[PDB]
Amino acid sequence: MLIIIGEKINGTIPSVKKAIEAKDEKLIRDLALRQSEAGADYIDVCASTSPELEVETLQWLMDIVQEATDTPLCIDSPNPRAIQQVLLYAKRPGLINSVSLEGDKCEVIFPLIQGTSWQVIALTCDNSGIPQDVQSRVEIAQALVEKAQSYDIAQERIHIDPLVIALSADNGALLKFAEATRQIKANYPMINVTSGLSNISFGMPLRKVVNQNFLTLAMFAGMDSAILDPLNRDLLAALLATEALLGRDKHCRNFANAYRKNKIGPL
Amino acid sequence: MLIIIGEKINGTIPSVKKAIEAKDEKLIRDLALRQSEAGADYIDVCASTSPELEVETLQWLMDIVQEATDTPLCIDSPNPRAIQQVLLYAKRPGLINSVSLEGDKCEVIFPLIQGTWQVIALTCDNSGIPQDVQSRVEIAQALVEKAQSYDIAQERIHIDPLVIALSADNGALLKFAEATRQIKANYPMINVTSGLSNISFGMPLRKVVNQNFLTLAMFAGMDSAILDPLNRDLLAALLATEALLGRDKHCRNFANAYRKNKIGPLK
Ligand SMILES: Nc1nc2c(c(=O)[nH]1)N[C@@H](CNc1ccc(C(=O)N[C@@H](CCC(=O)O)C(=O)O)cc1)CN2
Numbered sequence: 001m002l003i004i005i006g007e008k009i010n011g012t013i014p015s016v017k018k019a020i021e022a023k024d025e026k027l028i029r030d031l032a033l034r035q036s037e038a039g040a041d042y043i044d045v046c047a048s049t050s051p052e053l054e055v056e057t058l059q060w061l062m063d064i065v066q067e068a069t070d071t072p073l074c075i076d077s078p079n080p081r082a083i084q085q086v087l088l089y090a091k092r093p094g095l096i097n098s099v100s101l102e103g104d105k106c107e108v109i110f111p112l113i114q115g116t117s118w119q120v121i122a123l124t125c126d127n128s129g130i131p132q133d134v135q136s137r138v139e140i141a142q143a144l145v146e147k148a149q150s151y152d153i154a155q156e157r158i159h160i161d162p163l164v165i166a167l168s169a170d171n172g173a174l175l176k177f178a179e180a181t182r183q184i185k186a187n188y189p190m191i192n193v194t195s196g197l198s199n200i201s202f203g204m205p206l207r208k209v210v211n212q213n214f215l216t217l218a219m220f221a222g223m224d225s226a227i228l229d230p231l232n233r234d235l236l237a238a239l240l241a242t243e244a245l246l247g248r249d250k251h252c253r254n255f256a257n258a259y260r261k262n263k264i265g266p267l
Numbered sequence: 268m269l270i271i272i273g274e275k276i277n278g279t280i281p282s283v284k285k286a287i288e289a290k291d292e293k294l295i296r297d298l299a300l301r302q303s304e305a306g307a308d309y310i311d312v313c314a315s316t317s318p319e320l321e322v323e324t325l326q327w328l329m330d331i332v333q334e335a336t337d338t339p340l341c342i343d344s345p346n347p348r349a350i351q352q353v354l355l356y357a358k359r360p361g362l363i364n365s366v367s368l369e370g371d372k373c374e375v376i377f378p379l380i381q382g383t384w385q386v387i388a389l390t391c392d393n394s395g396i397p398q399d400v401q402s403r404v405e406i407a408q409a410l411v412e413k414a415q416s417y418d419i420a421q422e423r424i425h426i427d428p429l430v431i432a433l434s435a436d437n438g439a440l441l442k443f444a445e446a447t448r449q450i451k452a453n454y455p456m457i458n459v460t461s462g463l464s465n466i467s468f469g470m471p472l473r474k475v476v477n478q479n480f481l482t483l484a485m486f487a488g489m490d491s492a493i494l495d496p497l498n499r500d501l502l503a504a505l506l507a508t509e510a511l512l513g514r515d516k517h518c519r520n521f522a523n524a525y526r527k528n529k530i531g532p533l534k
């Protein structure tokens with residue numbers, strides 16, 4: 001069954017930016033609870049503030065989220081020092097978003113989780129940036145798994161993100177995401193492949209439609225977890241329909257339950 | 268690449284049945300036109316009336332469609348004798364819906380199109396519609412073999428694996444994809460086709476399920492489908508899925524359609 005990382009608590013979204021500035025606890029609790037109620041397995045928290053305010057902002061977001069829901073945190077920062085300084089504010093282990101072959105991300109994050117039950121998203125990039133092909137992404141995923149192994153981190157705890165690019169930039173963006181996913185899972189059947197949805201549609205109209213269909217496909221290609229907006233009813237219906245279509249919803253009960261509970265459908 | 272057989276002109280849709288009984292040509296003319304304008308490659312025509320009226324009703328439908336559009340006909344009848352009696356009324360080669368190993372379907376239809384027409388061939392026989400993969404694959408081989416008897420090339424045939432309701436078999440889509448893989452493997456030049464609505468029988472939000480089934484079936488290798496191209500949401504899925512599969516250079520059909528208002532909010 002697809003693992004859902006709810007994306008909505010970010011500093012990039014203007015309403016969330018404004019709620020952080022205001023210390024608007026109600027808005028953050030409501031995003032937390034409703035993402036959980038829609039089926040999120042992790043609640044992403046991303047401060048998106050300046051460097052010097054990031055750690056305090058993450059701490060505030062984690063405190064408020066955990067008041068509202070027991071669903072575990074996905075700590076989203078591009079600064080491993082920030083992640084280090086907030087890990088202890090989590091009440092239970094969750095997901096770290098993320099590491100990569102860039103700079104010292106692995107050597108800061110992996111000692112911090114080596115021994116505990118934290119999981120980790122690992123992006124397929126390194127110091128030269130986004131890879132320019134499938135093969136490069138696959139080799140980077142291998143290098144990530146080996147590094148993780150040297151700190152005793154099992155492949156099961158790892159969500160490889162092959163950083164899908166925009167379909168407007170490369171019309172093979174999905175055919176290349178599906179190929180990297182097949183090769184990575186072929187080399188590591190216990191590993192998890194993850195993606196965000198939004199990058200795929202950057203540069204196109206009706207981005208929600210494009211995101212949905214990419215999800216519908218990415219699931220069929222083997223994607224195990226995804227960062228997405230589970231408050232998007234249409235997206236949630238497509239998600240659950242795709243779960244039933246891939247033979248993961250016994251007697252289509254979850255889909256039927258979601259409609260009867262008015263989780264999906266009009267409206 | 269997905270070849271669209273517009274399903275609208277049927278004798279089972281209450282409104283079209285009333286148009287046949289009322290001889291309301293305008294309605295049929297506008298379904299032919301709108302389905303062509305939406306991109307249909309073939310216009311399915313199905314009488315769905317008392318047997319002894321079927322030939323005359325098929326002829327009436329074929330004349331009105333033809334007068335309106337050059338988009339070729341898909342003659343839809345469960346009675347091969349009816350097909351035989353109306354074939355000469357088509358102004359140009361189209362598609363015949365359908366043959367199967369049931370009764371004398373092949374023995375009637377194949378000599379009819381030998382030396383000429385494309386054909387949908389269902390994977391069912393005198394015992395009914397098998398639900399398993401292996402039986403359907405074997406039935407398809409038998410059909411391709413019998414079609415070869417009349418010099419009908421693989422390229423002219425659209426194999427329909429008759430996908431059943433997901434609520435009746437949760438593996439229906441998985442089985443579709445596997446049948447498709449095997450059939451194509453054996454016959455790389457053939458077409459695989461499906462309708463979209465059977466899959467969602469017995470589930471709520473049928474249109475949602477149908478649209479995700481379409482996306483999945485396209486990635487699985489479906490070549491043609493009988494569907495409603497007047498459905499704004501289904502067309503937006505279809506076109507987003509064409510772009511995601513690498514088939515819409517620069518995403519130009521998707522953008523063009525959006526610009527023309529074809530897909531997206533009706534503003
Ligand atoms: N590891 C990893 N982490 C990530 C991303 C990834 O790729 N991989 N990409 C981002 C995923 N997070 C978001 C958060 C919000 C939006 C966003 O745009 N939200 C709108 C859009 C609404 C919608 O489409 O439903 C909103 O209004 O809430 C997109 C990605 C950042 N974190």
Ligand SMILES: Nc1nc2c(c(=O)[nH]1)N[C@@H](CNc1ccc(C(=O)N[C@@H](CCC(=O)O)C(=O)O)cc1)CN2
Nearest residue numbers: 274275277280364365387427461462464493495498
């Ligand atoms: N070879 C083959 N032929 C077939 C089918 C198939 O499987 N395979 N199945 C049927 C396909 N034709 C239709 C026509 C109309 C509808 C239908 O239900 N239409 C609604 C709703 C349209 C919509 O959902 O957008 C309407 O109001 O027009 C469903 C299947 C019969 N012909």
